[PDB]
Structures are given as structure tokens and as C-alpha cells.
Amino acid sequence: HMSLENVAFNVVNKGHFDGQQGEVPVSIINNTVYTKVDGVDVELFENKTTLPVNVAFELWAKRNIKPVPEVKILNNLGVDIAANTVIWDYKRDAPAHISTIGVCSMTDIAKKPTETICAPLTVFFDGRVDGQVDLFRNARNGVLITEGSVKGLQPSVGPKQASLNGVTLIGEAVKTQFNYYKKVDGVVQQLPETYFTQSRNLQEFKPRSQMEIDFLELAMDEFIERYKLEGYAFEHIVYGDFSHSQLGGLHLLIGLAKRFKESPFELEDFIPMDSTVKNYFITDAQTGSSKCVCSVIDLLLDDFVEIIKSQDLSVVSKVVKVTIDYTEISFMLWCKDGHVETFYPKL
Amino acid sequence: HMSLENVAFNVVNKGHFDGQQGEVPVSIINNTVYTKVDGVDVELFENKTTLPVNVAFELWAKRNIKPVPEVKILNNLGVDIAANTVIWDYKRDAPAHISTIGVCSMTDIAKKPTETICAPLTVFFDGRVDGQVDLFRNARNGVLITEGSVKGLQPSVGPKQASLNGVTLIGEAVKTQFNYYKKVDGVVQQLPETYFTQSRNLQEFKPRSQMEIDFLELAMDEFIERYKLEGYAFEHIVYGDFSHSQLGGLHLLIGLAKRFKESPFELEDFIPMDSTVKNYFITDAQTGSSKCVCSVIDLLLDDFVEIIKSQDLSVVSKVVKVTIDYTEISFMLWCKDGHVETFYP
Amino acid sequence: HMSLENVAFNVVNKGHFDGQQGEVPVSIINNTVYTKVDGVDVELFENKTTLPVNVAFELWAKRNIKPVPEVKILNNLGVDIAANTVIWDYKRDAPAHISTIGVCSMTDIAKKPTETICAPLTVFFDGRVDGQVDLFRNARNGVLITEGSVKGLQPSVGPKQASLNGVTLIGEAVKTQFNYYKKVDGVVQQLPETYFTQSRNLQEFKPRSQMEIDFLELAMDEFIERYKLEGYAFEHIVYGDFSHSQLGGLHLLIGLAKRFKESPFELEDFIPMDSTVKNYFITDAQTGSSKCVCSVIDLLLDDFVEIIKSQDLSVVSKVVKVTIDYTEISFMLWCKDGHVETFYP
Amino acid sequence: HMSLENVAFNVVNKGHFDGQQGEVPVSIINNTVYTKVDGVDVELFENKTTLPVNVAFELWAKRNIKPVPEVKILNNLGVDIAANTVIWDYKRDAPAHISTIGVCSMTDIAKKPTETICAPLTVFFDGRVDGQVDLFRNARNGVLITEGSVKGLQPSVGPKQASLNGVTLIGEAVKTQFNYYKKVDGVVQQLPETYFTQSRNLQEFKPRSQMEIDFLELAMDEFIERYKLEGYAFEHIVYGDFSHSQLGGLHLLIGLAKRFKESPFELEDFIPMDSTVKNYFITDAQTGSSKCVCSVIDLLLDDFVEIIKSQDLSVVSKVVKVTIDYTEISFMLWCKDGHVETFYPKL
Amino acid sequence: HMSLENVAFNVVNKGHFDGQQGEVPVSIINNTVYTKVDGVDVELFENKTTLPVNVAFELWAKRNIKPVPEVKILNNLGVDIAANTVIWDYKRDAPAHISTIGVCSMTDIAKKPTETICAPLTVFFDGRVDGQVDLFRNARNGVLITEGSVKGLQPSVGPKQASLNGVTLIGEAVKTQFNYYKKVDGVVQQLPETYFTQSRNLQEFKPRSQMEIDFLELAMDEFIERYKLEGYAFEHIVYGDFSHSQLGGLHLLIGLAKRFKESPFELEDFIPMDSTVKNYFITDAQTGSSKCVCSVIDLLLDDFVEIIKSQDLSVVSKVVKVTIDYTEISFMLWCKDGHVETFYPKL
Ligand SMILES: CN(C)CCNc1nc2cc(O)ccc2c2c1C(=O)c1ccccc1-2
Ligand SMILES: CN(C)CCNc1nc2cc(O)ccc2c2c1C(=O)c1ccccc1-2
Ligand SMILES: CN(C)CCNc1nc2cc(O)ccc2c2c1C(=O)c1ccccc1-2
Ligand SMILES: CN(C)CCNc1nc2cc(O)ccc2c2c1C(=O)c1ccccc1-2
Ligand SMILES: CN(C)CCNc1nc2cc(O)ccc2c2c1C(=O)c1ccccc1-2
């Protein structure tokens, strides 16, 4: 007996859908779900999705509450749909996938991922759930995560971090680093060598290497000296140039983090979604320096240094391709007289 | 297991809530309830009430589908709430009463009408349902209908007509004339002698007496002659005067019906609810004669004639009170030289 | 003390805003205004405009309830705004003009039409209201209607019909034919000689000449013979050709009216507004003949005949300009071998 | 002349409804009330209630702007409705009570609390308003607060704190500790002995005893030693256990406060209302330890210690009842071998 | 080819409308504009205006992204409309002006400011845009800003600060101090001598003089001694009196800033718009002292001192007028025995 009232009962009593029997009184108004508690209405859910309020509510209640891959990873791997779960996208406050399998009568295209309607879709399978490894083996198109070895399959080791209830973290009490596998048209793929973004935020940025600690602590000139980064235009690319009306560079999150601690600025996230590369409209409050489209990526600084030090610097401009989060990211490299002028990603 | 999806299953399979088990998929968008049929969304309900969409839906699904009193009667008798049913008001496309008893978890103030929260409210009880006569006897404030006698309780014979799924009718396959009873502060009240309005509509108006047939068929002068209605200003009150920019008279539905057949006009129902007396903004399409507030009542013409012929006509202006549909309706009577000038509710 | 609650009190008690003091309880939900009557919510107004619900409500309550020019006339004369009234557009269920003068604190650009903000706008003035003729004289841009002469001002006699509470009519109890005047940049303009459209509707179409009676009663061939309309392609233009997948002709309302009586069809009014020329998507239910854009005008047939009989027919194709409802309507005239092929607005 | 426009005039000119004459222009759209200022629309109110926008607006404008009991107290005492005021619930952004008396034509069931429609309802009366003590004496069902003695009536001394415009505070410039009285079916009640919750928040938590200061300053083991709390499982119940995927314990706000200062975590308030016991879905960002339903109460630590030290510890599991904020709160006590395993409230 | 989809393409690709050709898929729901990215809907804009969602979206996309005068300045100067730009009001999240010129087919009253429909309106002209100085010269009613001299016209030097993408700042990489000019009925006006508000915020308040540094650092009594402010009731007006239920004084932002650092309080901005004088409902969390209408202005403290020291103190009460931000602000001055009692602005 699946129902709006039963979903609400679960949310009230268990914090999420947990398959318990029961009903509470519910009111729907203003894209909002309320329940009655002691004669008054209490908000349980505000719909921010493009689905009907009651459907969005159910999908949210049925969200995966274990560590799951960040949505940017799933997107980059071509995932269309999940087997028997909902990946909730906390960046969009909406389901990561528009359809479901065995979750919700209004969004389900199928009850089981083996139905032929699923064949053309890349289905996400979670090896931590009994039976899902086998379903991946039978699926035409799919992506699988596991915590350990799968007999016969070569793994790709994924990022250290995963999302738990919208908190991106590196697990200590729980495992967040998965093995990844992928199948296309019934054939297992070799996933490419890749860097991974670090998924940090501007304000509570934690360094993850000695070089990052050095970057944060040292002044610009000493850092560049120590790591012998002369000619790589770090002053521009990483630290940023706030001297002109158009803000120069500032393409690495760690650089934004450093600046923010010194002097606050505004970041407009004008396409608010999870992605490997983010585009921001930045206004520096101290100087008035601004830029409409500032491309930003959170690479470990050491990774960024490896990338820029692995390029030929003998041409004015060219596109540099880098596998990051399993996708091909295009960077523009501008050089002059054998040194870098700038280097930035394209979204 | 009451639920949105179960209510929808009942509506889809049984046409209304009928206590069947089952669920269908539902989508709610704005004020509309949809169900999925073969991959597409089909509208089941558009909310026109001031309640939440899913609540209004349930109340509508649980509406009484037997003949029930017209809402104007219930309102006139001071009914606040119904015991274990929903009276759906088809004039408002909304519940007649905002709260319920034993119907819906979101609107219920009680599960049974004996709870002390119900004591100050006038609860409607339906004697056709087992147990409800006894509940009326124990209730402090209430209105009861029955199809037959209740031992010891003095009845008031109600209107001939009732509402069945929003159709007002005089039943042949079903009974629509009830006995009425009322209690206030624990004490049974004597309901007053009353006329009843006829609940007809302008376009499909059916006469219900020889006098009404005569009114519709005969020209003004011969009708007035035959029923000896000289000096009662029927030409004004009933037929209406369309000769000036302000429309004169036209206070009886039958008069509106006659004119409508001859020449169409616009009626704006600017307070769209069920009531004994209705107010309309009328514009006559043929002449341009109009009036912002035209008070209209559907009395049997014979009843209207009895009322107006039972007045003293020796005073310029006077308020005349008449019990109709159990309520006191005030009429203004204007006279001059021993004849009526006008008479309107 | 202007207020939502006071507007509602007026609507409830007087049918429209009438400047009475008082308040009733009001609820606003989405785009609907409700008032509380005996414990329940009754709808007073559903907002179909692009204004805020409470503002649209007030403008509607303050609508002009006298005969006023049809909106198509006001639009054709370039009217931007009204002085101290609201012209309600019943075709759009919205105000004819987005701003007001001396009506409503939320929409007013001025309290009096003499304020300099009004100077660039063509302000509508109603000579039936004290002071408005004088305001027109002082206004830089304006349109004036009156029921009689204004000393020194050369009149244009307007259409016979006007709109009274959304009913287009030729007044008998009230005057609906106005004199018109217009000023541009401080200078009175000579309004052109014009035909007027008749503002009839498909279903309740009434002929207004012997020729129109003949058209409706006679078969095609005898009508054309009697009025000697050979070579003017009336069979195409007026009667319509339903023989092919694309519907031919059918550009006069009277022709639509005749066919509708014989055999129903669908008309999609895909730009639902008042205008001199209307465009419809027509599907003929009997034959399946259809046309996405069928241009239709309601001219008195006699006027249409005068127009088409006053053309030179020696050129293949030509634009014919005709003043109708004070605006220049372009017609395409297609000829071949000295006869008309088609003629449409 | 009560009206939408008059309410708006009061809000604009006086900050709340204050009975002044006047009108401003108002627009209603999008569950929002706007007023026109110099040719442009300014938002005055966004409706988050289940009432009509214009009605919610009026009730909010007519909210009590003196210190008033927290809603959890009023709820716990069975209050249904207030006499001649509106208690605004700032946790729900809505009226605490669905009906009114002498406030608003759309919500009023009565103009005076003596009308017989009020008899079955528990009416809240404020002794600081002239006449209300007498109205309580005549009422069948009611709750009364005063600042001082009422002849003949034994008081219950309420919490130190009250709510002033949604700020919970202990008054210095104003009195916030009331005497409470209650009547049921025309009979004055003896209110029970009760603990009170402290109504603090996680981030700006202020200790209110030496023991709380000690808890915040000292490390776990020294605190437990000093207050001789061995065997009471404080390490679990108060400090929390973040070592496993399921977060253990953490049922006292002060424990949450301590952890939060050390290491931030996410709290989902999935039933956002005022209540003595709160249920949160917690995700610890550092470890990945989480729990869907973590029951949390803000008792003075000394009170909590008194409660746990006043229990028999000789049974595996049982329900412990405690009067808090005038209501009976059920706790589960789990023991083993004469020591506590865990102890937590139920909502 | 102007269109919803083209506006969205510009927002996605350029961060704002920049005249680029292209279209993306768009969904409109819930006063919200979404675009489709890789099979899912991403929010681009939430309409908080009283305009249609798609129109508000376009105006926002076409907002001026250079430093522009704060809206309070434009309002104070009587500006009705802007020539060929949109001034976005970030305080209201809406256009500063209801109509446009040469911006948007749905809001335009004209394509060029020379059309006669514009004659009665005060049109804002930006001298940094080619041709606009000349348009001001031909306009009947207008306000002009420039960065430098205009031949023949005497300038008024405006505030140091301007708004850049909703960030009020004093430019270093960009110019934010403009020359102002104004025309009424075809005649150039002499703008009055004026003080300017400083446009700071409570939490990140930066002093801009030695006196302000002293105010923030020194205790009350020493500050008053040093600047010889005895008898001017600074203890009341600037510092505030929290000793009674009604909060006394506290009319200068710097005073609020000082208090806030010591002890947080609640400020309800009940008319949320840009204005020279702001009215707040204040509740002090520490004491419970409150006031429904607390008028607050951010004057440089030195300016405030000059103003109060330039008044006659020999009458009980009177209105003091002060030109601030080009408008006449009325203050009430209350005196007794030759000293100030209080002094506060009226909104
Ligand atoms: C264990 N280490 C490898 C990294 C620990 N270092 C830091 N952790 C932080 C954690 C935070 O939540 C915020 C700032 C932090 C900072 C460091 C630094 O080394 C550092 C240097 C300069 C500014 C901030 C931090
Ligand atoms: C049993 N009789 C007393 C009523 C039968 N007479 C009529 N029935 C009608 C039923 C309809 O559905 C519509 C019009 C009706 C009319 C009569 C009339 O006698 C009469 C006279 C003039 C106009 C209409 C009707
Ligand atoms: C005063 N006369 C010029 C007009 C009277 N003639 C008609 N009046 C009608 C009034 C209606 O409400 C509906 C149809 C009508 C028709 C006529 C006709 O002559 C005629 C011919 C063919 C069809 C309908 C009508
Ligand atoms: C007057 N005393 C009884 C209590 C004063 N002590 C504290 N007040 C605080 C007020 C705040 O707004 C935030 C943290 C506070 C803290 C104390 C502590 O003693 C303490 C110890 C460890 C961390 C925070 C605080
Ligand atoms: C360059 N000087 C003229 C001003 C620099 N002084 C300050 N800047 C601040 C910038 C901030 O973002 C926040 C607080 C600040 C404070 C000062 C002070 O002098 C001061 C004194 C007491 C409290 C805060 C500040």
C-alpha cells in the first residue's frame, strides 16, 4: 500500500522512506507538502524540481542514504538511470535521473533493469546491493560500483570521496572509494586513466598535500621559487590578477580559497549543477575587478602542476585535452616566447 | 489505509469513494489531480475550493450521492457541519461545510458527533443512515431529516425537491421529500410554517400550477383580468418594466422565464451561492434596460399571489416578513391610493 | 478608505463599485477573490488578466456600466487610457487599457487627465460626465464621445451599437450612438468617412436589411440573379467553397451564419480580442474542408456589395483600401477576364 | 475600517499592526504581498502558511510583540487558541493556532473568549493584559500566564526564557519568566513538577552551569572522572560515537554543540516545528558516520545527570518517563551488568 | 532574433545577455526558468519581481554589469527610466524601473530616449556610453553620470561608491565615483550640497576615518571625552540604551556594528528596498530590549558629528533638515536645558 500518506508517515517516523506501514494526514499547497501535527500544518517538503510535487516528494523520500558517487561522475560516465534506487542531486535539489526502475509508479519505466525498455539506457548498478553485480553482467549498457574485486573484471579505482546525504566526504566510518566498471552495447570497457576533482568548497577549504599547505601559507613569490614554477604564469592562472577592470586568471579553486580568506568576493553560480568544471560570474569586493565567465576547477594543486608542466609551450594558442572525472576536459593554453600566458578549462 | 492513491482508485473504478481497496498512480499539479492511464495523465479533479487540492479531492470523492437537502435549506436552518458525510455544494463546487466528522483526517474535528467539540455546532444528521436518529437525540445542537415518522418528535414537512448529484429534482424512483427536525441547546424547536422556493432555472422553467401555465401562455392584460389582480402592480413586479434605462421590477423567476423566451438577456450571478433570494445584475439585450441589483425569488406564482393579496395596502411603505425555506424574508411593500406600487424581497 | 474589503462590500451589496462605505471579509487564493458568507467562501472574481488579482478585481468592480464604445473602435482611434473610468474588455476579460487616471492607486499614472504625464497619451473622455468635454479641450491627445453637439466641434457620427456590460446592442431604453471627436498633438482631427462593422455573432445572427433577409432565405443562384451580382464571385467570397481540402473564401460573417444554420462547423478564435477584422481557424464538420487563417468581417451585406461593385476589375491583383470602424482595412482583389476571382480583407 | 491596505499601512509605518488609520497601495501575487513605493513594488510579506496570503499577512501583522511563551510550552499545555492576540510561530513561519478570538474577521470564531463556541477549547490568557485574569476565572478551559501573584491561585513557575519576536531569550530589560495556571472543565489544575528545556542553538551555545563549562572545556575522560559519571555511558549518550557507519548516541544538545565546534556536521530538521524533543537526520562530515533519526533534547547538563542518576539500572530495557516542559517525555533506558548502555528520548 | 531561448543561451554561455546568436531548450514552471543540460533541468532564474517570469528573466539577463549608481541615489534624483540599459535592483531582486528604452519588446515604451513618450520622464543617461551625453543635452528631463568633464556643465561630485553586480564598492581596478548632472523641463539644475551615506553592512563594517576607528576601539566614556561630545547624547543616539523594554536610540549604523560585534541582535528589514534611511524592527537577544521602528542611517561618524554640532539646542523639539544622497532628510531634534536628548532621522 504505497501512497502519499504512507510516504509522509515514513518521513515523519523514520526520516526517509523505510518501507514501514502507516499513514499521516497530508496537505498539498504551493508546491509544498505539509502534515498535520497536533492541529497545525508542518512543512515536510518544498518541491524545487520540474516533477509534480507529490512525485518529487516520494523520490526524495526514497533517495539513497548510503555514500554514492557524486553526480558529476555519474554524468561523466553516461549514466541515464539507476537500478532500484534514487540518486538525489543535492546541487539541483532534484533527482539525478528523470526516470526510475522499481522505485515509483509515476516515474518507473520498468520494475527490473532486465526489461527490454532499459536496454538502450546506461543503468547504474550498486555492487553493495545483493544481485546487482549479476544484473550488470546481464545488462547491455551499464555502470557498476563495488567496494572490492569482481571476478574477471579489471577495476578502475574511483575518487576517494563520495556523497552521503549531500555531504561530499572521504569516509572513515564508511567506505567512499569505489571500483568502477562500464559496459557499452554488451561489451565491458576499459575506463581511461583520469585525474579527479577534489570537490572542496571555497570557505572551508582543506589542503590535501604539502604543496597545497605551502600555497596557502607562503606568499606568492616564495611559493613560486620553492616549486620552481617560473614561466608557468601561476601569478595569473592560480593567484589571479585583480589590477584591471577585467579579472585575470583565477581558474583553480585553491586560488579562490586563498583570496577569499584575505578579501571576500561574490561568486554567481549561474548554472547551478554538479560538474567537473564550474563557471562563475565573479565580482571582487575590494578592487571592483570582475569577470562574467570565470572557469574554475578543483584539482589537487600537485595534479594541476603536473598537467601544466607536461605541455609543449612553443605555440601561441592551442587546445589541451585532459581526462578528469572520467571525461575529456578541454583547456586553452596560451604561450609566448616559451612561457605560459594563461591556461584555463572550458565548460 | 486511507490515501490519495486509494481515493483515486475508487474514483477511477467506482465513480466515487466506495471503500474499495486499491491504488492508482497520481500526479498533483497546481490545483488539479491526475492519474496515469496507459502512460498519460488524465484529469480526475480540478480544485475550485479554498481547501488544499488533495483534501478537496477526498471530500468530493466522499460526497453524499443520495438525494440530500438543497444547501439553502441547510444554511437557513443554521447547519454548521454534517455527521459522517459530506454535502457537496454544486453551486460553489465546494463542500457545504468546512469541517467534517468521521470523513477525512485533514478536515475532521471529531470522529463521532458525540465528542464534546461538536456540542456548540449544529450538526446535520441523516435518519436514513443507521444510528443517526439516536445521535440527533443525544446531540445538543442539530438538524435531522427522515423519510418517515420518529416516535415522539413532531415533524416539519420539507420541500418536495432535493439535490441528487447536483440535480435538483422531485423524486419518482427515489424519495426527495423529508421530515425535518431541529434542536438548539439540547431542546427540540418548533419549526415555523413556511413557504418553499421551487428551485427552477430560467431556461428550462416548468410551470407547476394552472395559474403558472396561464401566466406563461396569456398576455399580461388577460392574465391580470382572469385572476383579478388589478391594483397589485403585477405589470411591474412580475413582468418587469424595460422602458427606462433602469429596469423596473422583475422579482419573480417565472417573470424572468417568460421574458427570456421572448427576448434573451444577461444575468450576472455576482454572489454565486445557493440562497432563497438571489441577486442578479441584469442587462436586457433588446432594450438596454439594466439594473445592478435585481432581487429574484422562485415562488410558486400561487404562493406569491396569496402573499401579496394578504397585505394591507393603506400605508406608503412597510416591511413585510414572510417565512420561506424556514427563514424570515423581508419584503418592501410600497403603496399609493390603495394600490401597490412595488413589492420586492 | 479605499480597500480590497470595501471593494468586495460594494460588489456584494451593489453588484459593482458604487462608493458605499463598508467592509466584508475576503480571502485571496491564487487568482481568485472570495468573501465569507455564513461561514463559507464564495467566489466573487476569477482573475484572467495579467494584473495582480486584487488590482484586476478593483478595476473590474469599477468598470463603466453605461453603454460605451466597443473596444475595436477605441483601439482603431488610438485610445491609450481612459479619464476617470475603466473600459472593461469582455472579449479579453481584462481592462481595455493597462493604466488608469483617477481610478485605482495601483494602476493610476495620474489623478486627473490634465497632469503632464498624460500629455503624450490619447485619453478617452466621456461627454456624458460633467467636466469631461472641457478636459478634452485642454488635453493634447484625446478621443471624446457625446450624445449631442459640442459647440464649435465638428462631429463624426459613430456606430449605432455600443457595449453595455459586455452586451453589444442598439439602445432603445438608452442611447448607444455617439458623436466622436479626436485630437492629436493639441489639434482637432477630421475623422474619415467610414463604414462600420455590425458586431453580430454566428449563432444569433439577425439580418438588418432586405438584401440580408434575401441572402439568408434564397438559394445562391436566385440571390445572385436578383441583385445582379454575376461575375463578383459571391459563390466563393461570401457563400464559401467546401469542395476541396482547403476551404475557399467565406469572408463575410453573414455567409458563415447561413452555413452554420445548415451544417455546424468549428471556429477557432486563435487571437481572442475585439477587432474590425477577425481571423479564424475553421474546420467544416460535414466535409472536412478547413483553413488555418480565414479572415472574416461583419459588414452589412449592402455595404459589402457597394464596395465590391465600386472596383475596377481589369487588373490581376491589387490592394483595395477601405475605411471601416475609422481604420484603413486592406483588401486583396483578384480578377481575371473582367470578373472577380476573390476579394478578402 | 479594517482592510488589507490598512494592515499594509501599519506594517510600513509602525513595523506591525498598531491600530493606525491609513492606506497604502497593495499588490498580491505569488503568495506575496507588495506595496508600491515611488512607482515600484516592494515585498512586505511572503506567505509560508496554509492560510490565504492576505489572511496570513494580517495575522502576522497582528502578532504578539511582547515576550510570550515558546510554542512548545503552549502545545504541551494543550492550548488551542489565544484570547485577543496572535502567537506567531517563528519555527513554522505561521500562526501557532488556526483560529482566533477578536483578531481577524476571516479566522475569528468569536469576538470575546466568553462566547459559548470557545467553551470546549483551551484558551490562552495573558495576565499582563487588563481583564484577562478575570476571563480565565470565567473560562471552562484555559491557560493563564502572569508576572506576579493571583489571589487564591497557586502558581507554577515557568521557564526562565520566552520568545520575543522569534528570539528566545532570558529577559533583563523585560520579564520572560511567567507564572502558569491551567483550568480543565472549569476546575483549576495542579500543574506537575517539570524540568525545562533550555532552547539553545547548536552554533551560539552558551553554558549555564559550571558543569556545562567543564563539559565544553575538558576532554571526555577528565570530565567523566570529575563528576564521577563512570558506568552512565556518557561517552555514548552525550559525546556520541562516530566510529561506525551508524552514529551512536549524541542525544543532548550540549554534546552536539561541542562536536560542532570541533568538526562541522549536517543536521536535517525533517519535522521543522517547535518541540521539547527534536528529531534530526545527522551526517558527520569528518567521518561519514550518520543516523536517520537522532533524537535530541536541550536539557541543562546538570538536569540530565540528575535524571540518569535517578534510575534503576538492573533491567535490559525499559521506558523512563520524565516531565519536561509540562509534558511526559518517554526515554528508553538500555542497561547491561548494572551500567547504562544508552538512554535517549522518543519524540 | 530576440527570444527566451536566445536569452537563455547567452546566460548559459556568457553569464549574462551579450548579443550572441544561439538557442538552448527552456522550461518555464513555478515562476522559474530552467534549461535542459544532458537530459535534466537546471534552474537559471527564479522570478521575485511583479513582472511575468520570462520578461523579468530577460531584464535580469540585460542588467548593467558595469559600476552604476546605487538605486537610492537614482531614486533621490527622481530617475524614472534608463536609456538603453537596465539598472537591476539587487535589494528588491527586480528592475529599478518598470519601463525600458531600447531593451525589451515587452517593457519598452520607446526604442530611443528622444521619442516624445519619454519627454515627461526623468531619463538616466550614462556618459560612458557613446552618444549618451548628447542625448542628455537634447532631453527635457534627465540625469547624467560621467567619469570626467562635460564642456559647459558644472558637475556635482557623487559618492565614492557604486554598485557592481549588486556589490557596493569603492573601485580600485574600476572607477565608481561619478560626476552628476540633472535637467528639469529642459533646464540644467544646480544640484544641492549633500552628505552621502556610506552603504556599509552591519557585519563586515569597515571604518573610514580615525574617529570611526576610535569609536570602534575605545569604550564609550573615553571616546566621548576625546572628541568632546558631552551634552550631545551620543550614549543614547549612537551607542543605544538597552536598559528598558523599549530600546533607546541606536540610529547610526556604526553604533549597530559595534553592538553586533559585542552581542548579536535581530534586525527585521520590514521594507526591504534601497533607501538613504532604513527602518528596522530590532530585538536585542542579550537584554530583550526592542523597538518596532528603529530609524538607521549610515553616515560617516565625522559627518554625523558635524551635523549635530551645527544645530541650535535651545528648543524642546523641532525638525532638522539635511541634504543626504541628494534628498532632504528630516531629523527630529529633542533638547532639554541646552543639551541634546535625542536626534533621529525619519524615513
Ligand atoms: C592534515 N593536513 C595535511 C592538513 C591540515 N591543514 C589545514 N586544515 C584546514 C582545515 C580547515 O577546515 C580550514 C583551514 C585549514 C588549513 C590548513 C592549513 O594548513 C592552512 C593554511 C592556511 C590557511 C588555512 C589552512
Ligand atoms: C404537468 N404540467 C403542469 C406541466 C406541463 N407544461 C409545460 N411543460 C414544459 C416543460 C418544459 O421542459 C419546458 C416548457 C414547458 C411548458 C409547459 C407549459 O405549460 C408552458 C407554457 C409556456 C411556455 C412553456 C411551457
Ligand atoms: C427587423 N427585420 C429586418 C429582422 C427580422 N428578421 C429575422 N430575425 C431573426 C431574429 C433571430 O433572433 C434569429 C433569426 C432571425 C431571422 C430573421 C430573418 O429574416 C431570417 C432569415 C433566415 C434565417 C434567420 C432569420
Ligand atoms: C557566564 N558564564 C556562566 C558562561 C560564559 N561562558 C561561555 N559563554 C559563551 C558564549 C557564546 O556566545 C559562545 C561560547 C561561550 C562559551 C562559554 C564557555 O565557557 C565556553 C567553553 C568552551 C567553548 C565555548 C564556551
Ligand atoms: C585602513 N583603515 C583606515 C581602516 C582599517 N581598520 C579596520 N578594518 C576592518 C575591516 C573589516 O572587514 C572588519 C573590521 C575592521 C576593523 C578595522 C578597525 O580599525 C576596527 C576596530 C575595531 C573592530 C573592528 C575593526
Residue numbers in the entry:
A (entry chain A), D (entry chain A), E (entry chain A): 0 to 346
B (entry chain B), C (entry chain B): 0 to 344
Task: Give verbatim excerpts from the published study on this entry.
Despite the rapid development of antiviral vaccines and some approved treatments such as remdesivir and paxlovid, effective antiviral pharmacological treatments for COVID‐19 patients remain limited. This study explores Nsp15, a 3′‐uridylate‐specific RNA endonuclease, which has a critical role in immune system evasion and hence in escaping the innate immune sensors. Structurally, SARS‐CoV‐2 Nsp15 forms a double‐ring‐shaped hexamer that consists of a dimer of trimers. All Nsp15 subunits in the hexamer can be occupied simultaneously by substrate molecules, whereas disruption of the hexamer significantly reduces the enzymatic activity (Deng & Baker, 2018; Kim et al., 2020). The catalytic triad, found in a positively charged groove, is formed by a lysine (Lys290) and two histidine (His235 and His250) residues (Kim et al., 2020).
The ligand binding site of Nsp15 with TAS‐103 is found on the catalytic domain but opposite to the active site, in a cavity that is formed next to the α6 and α9 helices. The compound interacts with the protein via interactions involving Phe204, Lys205, Pro206, Ile212, Leu215, Glu216, and Lys260, with an interface area of about 240 Å2. Next to the TAS‐103 molecule, we observed extra electron density corresponding to at least two additional TAS‐103 molecules, separated by about 3.7 Å, appearing to interact with each other via π‐π stacking. This density is located in the free space created on the tip of the nsp15 hexamer. Although the two additional molecules could be modeled into the structure with lower occupancy, we excluded those from the final model. For the TAS‐103 structure, the structural differences with other Nsp15 structures are negligible even at the region where the ligand is bound. TAS‐103 binds to Nsp15 via van der Waals and hydrophobic interactions with residues of helices α6 and α9 and the loop upstream of α6. This area is located at the core of the C‐terminal domain and shapes the entrance of the 10–15 Å wide channel on the two sides of the Nsp15 hexamer. TAS‐103 binding significantly narrows this area. Due to the loss of activity in l‐cysteine buffer conditions, a non‐specific protein inhibition, for example, by the generation of reactive oxygen species, cannot be fully excluded for this ligand.
